């Protein structure tokens, strides 16, 4: 359905966001 | 209800979209 | 639509993100 996908696609993007988070942590050492 | 709490969690994403940018512009300088 | 206009922000966000992924690249080298 239209509402589960849309809800699959802001899970997805939650995670790329967190990976970044993850990133400049490790950026800034 | 679903549509608001699907607003919500978009909301909360963009919101550290915002964040990791002006990160990424401090660890540029 | 609502439903439209929904699409269209996680569109947006998914657009920051690969922005984002790409100056971290860049950053690192
Ligand atoms: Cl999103």
Same mark, same amino acid.
């Given at each position: 359905?239209? &509402? +589960?996908? =849309?809800?699959?696609? &802001?899970? +997805? ?5 967190? +990976? ?5 942590? +490790? =950026?800034?050492?």
């Amino acid at each position: 359905g239209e &509402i +589960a996908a =849309i809800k699959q696609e &802001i899970a +997805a993007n939650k995670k790329e966001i967190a +990976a970044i988070k993850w990133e400049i942590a +490790a =950026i800034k050492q």
